[PDB]
Design an enzyme around this catalytic site. Structure first.
Site, PDB file in Angstrom:
ATOM      1  N   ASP A  21     -15.663  12.043 -13.054  1.00 54.43           N
ATOM      2  CA  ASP A  21     -15.265  10.715 -13.573  1.00 54.43           C
ATOM      3  C   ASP A  21     -16.015  10.234 -14.842  1.00 54.43           C
ATOM      4  O   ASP A  21     -15.940   9.042 -15.201  1.00 54.43           O
ATOM      5  CB  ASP A  21     -15.413   9.650 -12.445  1.00 54.43           C
ATOM      6  CG  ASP A  21     -14.294   8.564 -12.482  1.00 54.43           C
ATOM      7  OD1 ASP A  21     -13.093   8.934 -12.337  1.00 54.43           O
ATOM      8  OD2 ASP A  21     -14.621   7.356 -12.653  1.00 54.43           O
ATOM      9  N   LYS A  24     -14.780  13.132 -19.378  1.00 58.04           N
ATOM     10  CA  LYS A  24     -14.748  14.459 -20.028  1.00 58.04           C
ATOM     11  C   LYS A  24     -13.331  14.688 -20.587  1.00 58.04           C
ATOM     12  O   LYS A  24     -13.170  15.124 -21.743  1.00 58.04           O
ATOM     13  CB  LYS A  24     -15.101  15.588 -19.029  1.00 58.04           C
ATOM     14  CG  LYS A  24     -16.525  15.507 -18.435  1.00 58.04           C
ATOM     15  CD  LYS A  24     -16.888  16.773 -17.606  1.00 58.04           C
ATOM     16  CE  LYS A  24     -15.992  16.945 -16.354  1.00 58.04           C
ATOM     17  NZ  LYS A  24     -16.181  15.854 -15.336  1.00 58.04           N
ATOM     18  N   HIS A  84     -15.868  17.934 -10.381  1.00 57.10           N
ATOM     19  CA  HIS A  84     -15.874  17.733  -8.943  1.00 57.10           C
ATOM     20  C   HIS A  84     -16.581  18.907  -8.213  1.00 57.10           C
ATOM     21  O   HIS A  84     -16.484  20.061  -8.638  1.00 57.10           O
ATOM     22  CB  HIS A  84     -14.435  17.601  -8.427  1.00 57.10           C
ATOM     23  CG  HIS A  84     -14.337  17.090  -7.022  1.00 57.10           C
ATOM     24  ND1 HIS A  84     -14.781  15.838  -6.654  1.00 57.10           N
ATOM     25  CD2 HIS A  84     -13.836  17.656  -5.897  1.00 57.10           C
ATOM     26  CE1 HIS A  84     -14.559  15.654  -5.365  1.00 57.10           C
ATOM     27  NE2 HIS A  84     -13.986  16.743  -4.881  1.00 57.10           N
TER      28      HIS A  84
HETATM   29  N1  LIG Z   1     -15.732   1.217 -20.856  1.00 56.93           N
HETATM   30  C1  LIG Z   1     -15.407   2.527 -21.072  1.00 56.93           C
HETATM   31  N2  LIG Z   1     -14.627   3.156 -20.187  1.00 56.93           N
HETATM   32  C2  LIG Z   1     -14.353   4.432 -20.586  1.00 56.93           C
HETATM   33  C3  LIG Z   1     -14.794   5.142 -21.721  1.00 56.93           C
HETATM   34  N3  LIG Z   1     -14.308   6.407 -21.750  1.00 56.93           N
HETATM   35  C4  LIG Z   1     -13.555   6.494 -20.639  1.00 56.93           C
HETATM   36  N4  LIG Z   1     -13.557   5.325 -19.869  1.00 56.93           N
HETATM   37  C5  LIG Z   1     -12.668   5.650 -18.622  1.00 56.93           C
HETATM   38  O1  LIG Z   1     -13.345   6.677 -17.816  1.00 56.93           O
HETATM   39  C6  LIG Z   1     -12.445   7.226 -16.777  1.00 56.93           C
HETATM   40  C7  LIG Z   1     -12.486   8.772 -16.491  1.00 56.93           C
HETATM   41  O2  LIG Z   1     -11.481   9.469 -17.231  1.00 56.93           O
HETATM   42  P1  LIG Z   1     -11.295  11.074 -16.939  1.00 56.93           P
HETATM   43  O3  LIG Z   1     -10.871  11.371 -18.350  1.00 56.93           O
HETATM   44  O4  LIG Z   1     -10.403  11.326 -15.747  1.00 56.93           O
HETATM   45  O5  LIG Z   1     -12.463  11.972 -16.518  1.00 56.93           O
HETATM   46  P2  LIG Z   1     -12.805  13.386 -16.030  1.00 56.93           P
HETATM   47  O6  LIG Z   1     -14.039  13.664 -16.835  1.00 56.93           O
HETATM   48  O7  LIG Z   1     -11.568  14.246 -16.130  1.00 56.93           O
HETATM   49  C8  LIG Z   1     -13.138  13.359 -14.253  1.00 56.93           C
HETATM   50  P3  LIG Z   1     -12.944  14.661 -13.010  1.00 56.93           P
HETATM   51  O8  LIG Z   1     -14.410  15.005 -12.942  1.00 56.93           O
HETATM   52  O9  LIG Z   1     -12.412  14.162 -11.694  1.00 56.93           O
HETATM   53  O10 LIG Z   1     -11.951  15.673 -13.521  1.00 56.93           O
HETATM   54  C9  LIG Z   1     -11.046   6.684 -17.214  1.00 56.93           C
HETATM   55  O11 LIG Z   1     -11.011   5.393 -16.546  1.00 56.93           O
HETATM   56  C10 LIG Z   1     -11.282   6.392 -18.759  1.00 56.93           C
HETATM   57  O12 LIG Z   1     -10.310   5.453 -19.227  1.00 56.93           O
HETATM   58  C11 LIG Z   1     -15.690   4.432 -22.646  1.00 56.93           C
HETATM   59  O13 LIG Z   1     -16.161   4.850 -23.693  1.00 56.93           O
HETATM   60  N5  LIG Z   1     -15.918   3.127 -22.217  1.00 56.93           N
END
Ligand SMILES: Nc1nc2c(ncn2[C@@H]2O[C@H](COP(=O)(O)OP(=O)(O)CP(=O)(O)O)[C@@H](O)[C@H]2O)c(=O)[nH]1
Lengths: 392, 82, 205, 61, 85
Positions: A21, A24, A84
RNA sequence: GCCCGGAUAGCUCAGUCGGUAGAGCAGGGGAUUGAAAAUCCCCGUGUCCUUGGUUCGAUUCCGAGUCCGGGCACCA
RNA sequence: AAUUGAAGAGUUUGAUCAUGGCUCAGAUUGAACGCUGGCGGCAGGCCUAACACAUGCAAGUCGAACGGUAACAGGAAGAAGCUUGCUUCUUUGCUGACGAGUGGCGGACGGGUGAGUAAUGUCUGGGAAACUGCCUGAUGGAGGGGGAUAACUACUGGAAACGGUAGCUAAUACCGCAUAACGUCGCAAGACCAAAGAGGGGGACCUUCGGGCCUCUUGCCAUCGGAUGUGCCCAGAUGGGAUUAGCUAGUAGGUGGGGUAACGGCUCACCUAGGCGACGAUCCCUAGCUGGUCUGAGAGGAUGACCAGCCACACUGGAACUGAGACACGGUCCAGACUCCUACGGGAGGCAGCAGUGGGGAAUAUUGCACAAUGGGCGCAAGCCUGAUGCAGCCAUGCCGCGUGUAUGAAGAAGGCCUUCGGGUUGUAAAGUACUUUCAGCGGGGAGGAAGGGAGUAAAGUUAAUACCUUUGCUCAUUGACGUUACCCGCAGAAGAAGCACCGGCUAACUCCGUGCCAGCAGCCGCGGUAAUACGGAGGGUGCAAGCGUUAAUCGGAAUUACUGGGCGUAAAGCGCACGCAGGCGGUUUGUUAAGUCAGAUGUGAAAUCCCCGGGCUCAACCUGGGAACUGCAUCUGAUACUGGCAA
């Protein structure tokens, strides 16, 4: 196929590593977004990089998605890996191709034991470079807390040989840059210019006998079977015979198609990370983990003696000592094999945090060489990490 | 439409040509009216090199047989005086 | 293609001399002949009718070195010829080039004669021939090219036929390893002991 | 119903095989066999003589 | 199908419009005769026949009618009018 | 790539919802019949698939693989 | 010169002879699987799902038909920098050429599959009520005008696909007028019917300076032909079941009308009541057919993949259009089904074309190269297009060729095996030794497939013309996908190149150890319940050979479907008997017919494949010249004994 590849810039393999989360996948969409606003064509989004119903339902990554771009310096290849606990096997497959890893750290949590495993697996696959982008920087203002978070990332890399104290930790907001921000885009562009400074074009040995790590298999409907992997060593071109070497009874085929993400490349030299077309091979016979070699110069090596740095509960390994007969998983960067722990007379049971060396007998033969650094995972925890000393 | 052409029989890399009288709408080896003579392009110098039953060939010319220039080349090769 | 094995063991099975190891010494005599085709050569066989038909088939092939698929084709040609099949089959088996060269001293043994044709040394009418199964037409000649001429082996091997009978249907010059062929052999002129009769019955079925 | 030849097999209720014709004249109603050397029904253990049938390969050792 | 030979399609369409028109005008004069023969107008049927003669033979000369069909249209229909007149 | 049911004495298999592994047939002996079968009577011959723990003790609770069967997702 | 052609064995019973099935020995195959594995030559390669299919390519051409020119290279006027003619460069269809469009031609060819079809089809042989672009022979014409439209502009709909509205202009596009004949209709008379022009060269004449004008080439229109293909009709032949025996009512025929290129229930209107059927109609099931291929002594049986001919089909079903010709594989429309694109209103697509994929399956290939040769389309030509084709790749898939070496070597060794531990065998085999070097591997030489064509050149026809066009020689530069070729040379060195089945009888070839009716073997009869030539291993031997075996399938053996060529007292079988229709057969004589029959001739029996005698690849397979044959059918002319018909 469409648009044959044009040889313009030297290739580079990169990509995300880190905790669940931590944006990435959002950073992956945000990096090329700022780069779509600089040069070339890109800027895929949240809906595109994430492909599965499972992924876009719980906001996860189950398959290592890939994206391509290029700064005015070099040619680049981005590898979006998951974070994960049960998908660590997937990020290691992504770790086998990346010339330079890039750690994605959320400003809130920071250095984690899970983030510790994404780093430790980087040293055990051969990657020396990690540029850490602090994500969620627009969410933090309390710098005294954030500066203590940043230095803990550096010494954890310094714990695992990555020169973290020399590493420029990139700070920025990926959310705003992906949507079109002029402010935090430069924060994203920080890592971009540092990508052209911290991670150069390494030793591309194209004059060696061909060998290539099998990442995954993508059967093209209408073309045939395309295996994926970056060229470890040697060169390939359409009109060159290779073999299917590894786990099963080794067979043969012919190189008849190379694509740099749709771009038709005639000669895929060393370091080129693409999909390779197989002639007359079914989906079933070839599998994830084997290797493509020169026609008969890699035999099916079965046993080898390795120098293994056994970790502790404090270092990520077991918390209780384990006797002769342990059956863990062995990541040969893509080749997950279970093997026998043949203990030397002097170590009856392996205490957490030992400096030992054991002999391993594989359950599936594979290409083996003295100096092969491989980590050891079992039960979600990377229980160990070794490097091949002797090949039997 | 009648025509006088070749047939391309024999084997691989060792051609042979049944100079024949056929309908132009057929294939190269298809339906024909009659084979009239033959030709061997590998016949350098030996007892037998090329045969064209000239009299029956000229009979079809009056009929309206469009001779292909390759065949016409052979007629220019096995001339009335040469 | 070739037997390429212990070529005296064959003579012990058939019991007849085949001149396989003809070479330099006249008669073998150092192989415990006639009573030891193998490990149990002490067993006086029953040797039934199918055996006597088949032993005849093998013997002729064992002499000239021909294979079943190849030898049967010689029988197929022998049937379509005019006259008598049992004679023309012996004509084709004789008409082989390596058999012709064997009748000229070149290639003291039939195997060596096959090798000599194999290594472009044999030439007919100014034409190099590699095929040992080259069918020799009547009224021809034979010689050796300047390259492989008198190469220390042709000389010694030629001495053998000088002590043999030297049949009628051909003529040797021996001036420059020279030969000349004539009309095709007659049944009465060749081998003088073989019974091809048993062979014709075998290929009938 | 097909007779499984050789001394010792390695089947477990699914094991995909290959069938070849021929009767046994020893079992009632058996008109086929199993091919030893084809799919999952592998080669018989340590057979030197006549290994084309029974699917043993040439011994490397 | 998309092919450079699609002209043959549209040209046949354009040819059909000219063909539908000319073939129709020919048939009316033939049908004009049948309206006359049923009435018994021995002079008018002859009038209709002599009037449609140059237009039915023209279609045969323009690669439309098979120059025997049109001849047959003259023959039998003539066999009717002299049978009536 | 993800999710399930299974690997138990020679064979065929039940038992858990932390208590020191059972049943049928098997194999052999006795009783037996002109002979045989049968029947009754006696017993596991087990690394509970492998591997670590939580624990007084782990088939068990789990975490992870290995193999087998079945289903679904991604398309250089 | 042209078929010189025919094998049996095992097994019932105590034993025999019969009858009589089952099985085997052989050849073959679009072969599959196991094992092993060297090269080459020539062929073959989705027979399973007529299942669905991404992408590329598989059918285009002509400016010497026309309006035009969006581009690229020149010419021209001019402009600009400045090396003032070195460059930049705006105008300009004026040349060389050419997208988009009108039009002509090809797209109906060639390539692919065998679903349907048991007869609307195919093969054979006759026949007439037919048509025929292009090619070509002969006879003649080739006069004079009009009205549009696309392209191109302007507006405008739709996401796109795809149109719409108003004007512009052309022709070898269209359409009258005229003119017509050995052309059409008709008894004749009479009536009526066609069109296209362009390009090269040029002295004089004429120039409203486009060009007229002459010649040459080609094309246009009409008609009769020839040739060619196609369409149609008739006769015979063209699988299994009678446990399918009756079927049919636009059906059988007629009179009249229509329709087709053409006769005809092909289609109508009415009349007649018939037409087909045991010498198998309908009905069901199955199936492309043929020349051929496989086996066979033949007669036949089976089969009919490749080559070729014919037919049908082109997502399923249906219809029509243009066109000489299709009721059309890369054509139209419609309905349906299945994918695909969508701004959800509405559209797009059809690999049974070459490749390739998924999938089906025991199983079958490369998203290769060239248009050089041949052929086809278009064009004056050069050339443009060609997944036809020519090659190449891949697989031992089949066929054929060759090699993996030769001479010598008796300690007649070692090791193994058997043993009467005497010895024999392995075994001249190997070691050693003296020679050799095919094909691979590496470095060099090197054919043939190529004929033409293009420019210039000279001569010759034709022409007013040393111009243009045609034709014949000459020269230059050349045209090869294959191709690091066929073949040749050198080089080093036995160097890289041997497995597979079987050994009881059948059926070529043996012993021992171990397991004991267990494990297993197997084609047939069978073996193994402690002594196995039959199981598993070891040694030896036998057969075959870059193949060897097993399985499946065809024929043969099978005279176990018997025409050539079997049986019926008891082996399987004479209806229980007789009558008798259809059907089959028939005494004796004369005359005649000449239908069956016989001879001879001619037409035909496509070519290739098979056979005889030769030629060419180093030979062979393979290709190929001529001949024979194609056992048959039709027609005519004779014989007419025999059979049948006719007459007594
Ligand atoms: N405030 C804020 N929120 C952010 C920023 N970058 C991302 N978010 C939010 O972080 C969350 C994670 O997005 P995600 O792209 O799924 O992550 P992941 O790294 O694939 C996670 P997994 O490990 O399950 O595959 C989303 O809600 C994205 O909109 C940022 O710079 N600021």
């Amino acid at each position: 196929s469409k648009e044959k590849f044009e040889r313009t810039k030297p290739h580079v393999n990169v990509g995300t590593i880190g905790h669940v989360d931590h944006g990435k996948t959002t950073l992956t969409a945000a990096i090329t977004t700022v780069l779509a606003k600089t040069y070339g064509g890109a800027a895929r989004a949240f809906d595109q990089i994430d492909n599965a119903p499972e992924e876009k339902a719980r906001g996860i990554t189950i398959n290592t998605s890939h994206v391509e771009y290029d700064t005015p310096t070099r040619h680049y290849a981005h590898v979006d890996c998951p974070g994960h606990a049960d998908y660590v096997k997937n990020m290691i497959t992504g770790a086998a191709q990346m010339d330079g890893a890039i750690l994605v750290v959320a400003a809130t949590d920071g250095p984690m034991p899970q983030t510790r495993e994404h780093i430790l697996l980087g040293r055990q696959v051969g990657v020396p470079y990690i540029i850490v982008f602090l994500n969620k920087c627009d969410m933090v203002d309390d710098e005294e807390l954030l500066e203590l978070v940043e230095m803990e990332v550096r010494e954890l890399l310094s714990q695992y040989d990555f020169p973290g104290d020399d590493t420029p930790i990139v700070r920025g907001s990926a959310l705003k840059a992906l949507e079109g921000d002029a402010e935090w885009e430069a924060k994203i562009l920080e890592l971009a210019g540092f990508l052209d400074s911290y991670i150069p074009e390494p030793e591309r040995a194209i004059d060696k006998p061909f060998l290539l790590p099998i990442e995954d298999v993508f059967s093209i409907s209408g073309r045939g079977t395309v295996v994926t992997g970056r060229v470890e060593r040697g060169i390939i071109k359409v009109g060159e015979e290779v073999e299917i070497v590894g786990i099963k009874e080794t067979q043969k085929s012919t190189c008849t198609g190379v694509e740099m993400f749709r771009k038709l490349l005639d000669e895929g030299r060393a370091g080129e990370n693409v999909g390779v077309l197989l002639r007359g091979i079914k989906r079933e016979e070839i599998e994830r983990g084997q290797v493509l070699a020169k026609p008969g110069t890699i035999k099916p090596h079965t046993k080898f003696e390795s120098e293994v740095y056994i970790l502790s509960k404090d270092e990520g390994g077991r918390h209780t000592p384990f006797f002769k007969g342990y059956r863990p998983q062995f990541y040969f960067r893509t080749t997950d094999v279970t093997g026998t722990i043949e203990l030397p007379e002097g170590v009856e049971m392996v205490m957490p945090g030992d400096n030992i060396k054991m002999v391993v007998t594989l359950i599936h033969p594979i290409a083996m060489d003295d100096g092969l650094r491989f980590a050891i995972r079992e039960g979600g925890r990377t229980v160990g990490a070794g490097v091949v000393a002797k090949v039997l | 439409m009648v025509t006088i052409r070749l047939a391309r029989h024999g084997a691989k890399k060792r051609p042979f040509y049944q100079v024949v009288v056929a309908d132009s709408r057929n294939a190269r080896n298809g339906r024909f009216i009659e084979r009239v003579g033959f030709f061997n392009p590998i016949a350098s110098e030996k007892e037998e090199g090329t045969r064209l039953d000239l009299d029956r060939i000229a009979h079809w010319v009056g009929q309206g047989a469009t001779i292909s220039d390759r065949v016409a080349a052979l007629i220019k090769e096995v001339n009335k005086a040469a | 293609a070739r037997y390429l094995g212990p070529k005296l063991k064959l003579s012990r099975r058939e019991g007849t001399d085949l001149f396989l190891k003809s070479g330099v010494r006249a008669i073998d005599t150092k192989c415990k002949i006639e009573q030891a085709p193998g490990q149990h050569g002490a067993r006086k066989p029953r040797l039934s009718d199918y055996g006597v038909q088949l032993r005849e088939k093998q013997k002729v092939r064992r002499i000239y070195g021909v294979l079943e698929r190849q030898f049967r084709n010689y029988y197929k040609e022998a049937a379509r010829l005019k006259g008598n099949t049992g004679e023309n089959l012996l004509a084709l088996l004789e008409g082989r080039l390596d058999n012709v060269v064997y009748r000229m001293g070149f290639g003291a043994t039939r195997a060596e004669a096959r090798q000599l044709v194999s290594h472009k040394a044999i030439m007919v009418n100014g034409r190099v021939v590699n095929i040992a199964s080259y069918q020799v037409s009547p009224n021809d000649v034979v010689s050796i090219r300047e390259k492989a001429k008198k190469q220390s082996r042709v000389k010694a091997a030629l001495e053998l036929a000088e002590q043999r009978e030297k049949p009628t249907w051909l003529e040797v010059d021996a001036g420059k390893m020279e030969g000349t062929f004539k009309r095709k052999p007659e049944r009465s002129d060749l081998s003088a002991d073989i019974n091809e009769h048993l062979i014709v019955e075998l290929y009938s079925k | 119903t097909s007779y499984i030849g050789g001394e010792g097999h390695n089947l477990q209720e699914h094991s995909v095989i290959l069938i070849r014709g021929g009767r046994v004249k020893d079992l009632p109603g058996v008109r086929y066999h199993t091919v030893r050397g084809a799919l999952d029904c592998s080669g018989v253990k340590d057979r030197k003589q006549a290994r084309s049938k029974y699917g043993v390969k040439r011994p490397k050792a | 199908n998309i092919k450079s030979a699609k002209k043959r399609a549209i040209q046949s369409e354009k040819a059909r419009k000219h063909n539908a028109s000319r073939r129709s005008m020919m048939r009316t004069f033939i049908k004009k005769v049948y309206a006359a023969i049923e009435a018994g107008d021995k002079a008018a049927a002859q009038k209709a026949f002599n009037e449609m003669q140059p237009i039915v033979d023209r279609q045969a000369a323009k690669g439309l009618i098979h120059k025997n069909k049109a001849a047959r249209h003259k023959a039998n229909l003539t066999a009717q009018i002299n049978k009536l007149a």
